[PDB]
């Protein structure tokens, strides 16, 4: 067929968003070098004894860094103290989270305007949340504290007498509110009395109680007593 | 049935890793007993400047050997004011340069084995060109932002430029085009024969098209290879 035409064609011929990004980054690196080196000095210099100070500092630091077009891209041009900066942000986050959780468990109210099943389910789901969070915490806090201690970051909140312990105590508060809802609903109906839900309910209560007793590490007076109030039904 | 027994069971109970903990102690051990060693490495990294990239290679070689004394590098260094940005810059500069040099040496010091039949030799050269094209296109794709960082960290960037190793690679790509057009112009005479003529239009096109592809990649042809191209055009 037509290989000559093809070769003549070839011979007679032998005679995107990223560039903008690169320039924006370059702009920052040139015109904000001193600003960034300043931030780096402050981070390196920082030391905290109050976790609330640390919070304020990370707040500040995030705000300052938000003036950078892309934090990672720009910072990769600098002798930025990544390890400590990460330690600080991570500490800030964990603390605030744990605190959220504790305020959520402590201030939990068994809404009497809720029927039995949704109420018990509410508490069960909360307990699950608490259990996951704390278990993750225990799973990571030792290596975390190893790093934090090097970086002048407080760790008392991380201990057993810290926010975690407070959380376990309110877990027992929860088992109380649950056994209370169970012993209540156990009276609020009928009639014939046991009945198939009057044995099932008693079990959900007993078992929730045991699950929490094991989680928290033990029971106080009033709840060991409520559990006793369950044994005798 | 028997729910009381169950509740009594629970009552009578309400009376009475090591792979990760080991790792943690090992790390704690390094952090305690290698703090000065690490702060020293960090000082040395921060202080460094290179003018020859070969010097840089030597440095990163050393740095890797030194860091290998750590039970887990990431775990230990996360305890220190380590210059992560620059250390990363250095290691990647070393890796890219050595990779590029491996490639350039492979394409330049490539031999068209005359002891191999047509198709396998042509496949060899085609696949090497593919390798080359992928590497260079990726390099061009990332080199600008790389150079931006490198310049900040006192890391050489000439090898990254168009007159750097990339140019060498493009030139040896044209040499590969000569060798392909050689294998074709040869095989177009050899087999079998007589009689003959199968693929004598196909093989020729494979030659022409390979030449054009390379010509476009490398940026042009010199005298002698453009001459091999006329030696192919006239068939």
Main beta-sheet strand count, sense and barrel state of chain A: none
Which range does the strand content of chain A fall in? under 5%
The total beta strand count of chain A reads 0
Largest interface in this structure: A-B, 46 and 47 residues
Discrete helix count of chain A: 10
State the secondary-structure class of chain A.
mainly alpha
What is the helix fraction of residues of chain A, given as a range?
over 70%
Shape of chain A: elongated
- The protein's oligomeric status is homodimer
What's the domain count of chain A?
2
The Rg value of chain A, from CA coordinates, equals 30 Å
Q: Calculate the terminal CA-CA distance of chain A, rounded to whole Å.
A: 98 Å
Order of helices and strands of chain A: HHHHHHHHHH
Main location (chain B): plastid
Subcellular location (chain B): Plastid, Chloroplast outer membrane
Organism (chain B): Arabidopsis thaliana (Mouse-ear cress)
Region (Leucine-zipper 2) (chain B): 56-77
What report would you give on this structure?
Chain A: It is found in: Plastid, Chloroplast outer membrane. Chain A: This is Protein CHUP1, chloroplastic. Chain A: Residues 54-75 are annotated as: Leucine-zipper 2. Chain A: It comes from Arabidopsis thaliana (Mouse-ear cress). It is classed as plant protein. Keywords: Actin, Actin nucleator, Chloroplast movement, chloroplast unusual positioning 1, plant protein. The structure is a homodimer. Chain A is mainly α. Chain A has 2 domains: 16-80, no CATH class; 92-233, no CATH class. Helices cover 73% and strands 0% of the residues of chain A. Chain A has 10 helices and no strands. Chain A has helices at residues 3-11, 18-31, 33-45, 51-65, 71-75, 82-106, 116-150, 163-185, 197-216, 221-231. In chain A, helix 6 packs parallel to helix 8 (163-185) and helix 8 (163-185) runs antiparallel to helix 9 (197-216). Chain A starts with a helix and ends with a helix. Chains A and B meet through helix 1, helix 2, helix 6, helix 7 and helix 9 of A and helix 1, helix 2, helix 6, helix 7 and helix 9 of B.
């Amino acid at each position: 067929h037509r290989a000559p035409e093809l070769v003549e064609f070839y011979q007679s011929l032998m005679k995107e968003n990223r560039s903008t990004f690169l320039l924006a980054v370059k702009a920052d690196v040139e015109t904000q070098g001193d600003f960034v080196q300043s931030l780096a000095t402050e981070v390196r210099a920082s030391s905290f004894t109050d976790i609330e100070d640390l919070l304020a500092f990370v707040s500040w630091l995030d705000e300052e860094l938000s003036f950078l077009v892309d934090e990672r891209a720009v910072l990769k041009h600098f002798d930025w103290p990544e390890g400590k900066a990460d330690a600080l942000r991570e500490a800030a986050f964990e603390y605030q989270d744990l605190m959220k959780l504790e305020k959520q468990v402590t201030s939990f109210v068994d809404d009497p305007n809720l029927s039995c099943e949704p109420a018990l389910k509410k508490m069960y789901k909360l307990l699950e949340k608490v259990e996951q969070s704390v278990y993750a915490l225990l799973r990571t806090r030792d290596m975390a504290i190893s790093r934090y201690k090097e970086f002048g970051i407080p760790v008392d909140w991380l201990s057993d007498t810290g926010v975690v312990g407070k959380i376990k105590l309110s877990s027992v508060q929860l088992a109380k509110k649950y056994m209370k809802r169970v012993a209540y609903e156990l009276d609020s109906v009928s009639g014939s009395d046991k009945d198939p839900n009057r044995e099932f309910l008693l079990l959900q209560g007993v078992r929730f109680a045991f699950r929490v007793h094991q989680f928290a590490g033990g029971f106080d007076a009033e709840s060991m007593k409520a559990f006793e109030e369950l044994r005798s039904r």
